[PDB]
Design a protein around this ligand. Structure first.
Ligand SMILES: CC(C)CN(C[C@@H](O)[C@H](Cc1ccccc1)NC(=O)O[C@H]1C[C@@H]2C[C@H]3[C@H](OC[C@H]31)O2)S(=O)(=O)c1ccc2nc(NC3CC3)sc2c1
Ligand SMILES: [Cl-]
Ligand SMILES: [Cl-]
Ligand SMILES: [Cl-]
Ligand code: NA
Lengths: 99, 99
């Protein structure tokens, strides 16, 4: 698909058996999801955004389905105001910015 | 161009006759630049994201070149960690997301 940018580029994802709405975010290195449980090992991380830093849990090797496309990668879980799909997963679904 | 996302989508912008680096950011509604001088009057705004928010100065109808493409629109100036080109200007340069 081609997604215009007149509105936020929101998509449905499936993660951890749950459906969520998330923003396709070329400005995000990593994927950051609101509080939820995920299986397996995690480690803490601090990540900076516009308003300073938040503490997150880093889960590696998490499968995800983004607007129907599967991939796998690291997911950060914590108190983000928006669920964001970052470049680490956008690459895997073949997303590009075109102009 | 077609910009893949294996690295950050950094481009050169020109604003006030000077070149700066900025992130093409589909997750940003608005364009936010580090402290600089711009002409005219400004209005107040707050913009929030990961970590919380920053207070910025809103300048309207500013001439800005993004990756060689000419735009004229709103620029927010304040203590952002990174210069961000948001959807207000990405739509002026004709950018879409594609996969
Ligand atoms: C979080 C999203 C939803 C909004 N932001 C754009 C976003 O692309 C921001 C842009 C950004 C990049 C880096 C530092 C600060 C901001 N990305 C972001 O925080 O991603 C984090 C993810 C993790 C941790 C790190 C690493 O990569 C960067 C960073 O991986 S924002 O906070 O920078 C921003 C920008 C413009 C803007 N305009 C607004 N307009 C107001 C609503 C009417 S609100 C707003 C918020
Ligand atoms: Cl990853
Ligand atoms: Cl590729
Ligand atoms: Cl604008
Ligand atoms: Na894991």
């Amino acid at each position: 698909p081609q997604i215009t940018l007149w509105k936020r580029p929101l998509v449905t994802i499936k993660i951890g058996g749950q459906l969520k709405e998330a923003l396709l975010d070329t400005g995000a290195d990593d994927t950051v999801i609101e509080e939820m449980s995920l299986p397996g090992r995690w480690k803490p991380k601090m990540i900076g955004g516009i308003g300073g830093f938040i503490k997150v849990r880093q889960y590696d090797q998490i499968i995800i389905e983004i607007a129907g496309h599967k991939a796998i990668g690291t997911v950060l879980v914590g108190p983000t105001p928006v669920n964001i799909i970052g470049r680490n997963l956008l690459t895997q679904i073949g997303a590009t910015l075109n102009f």
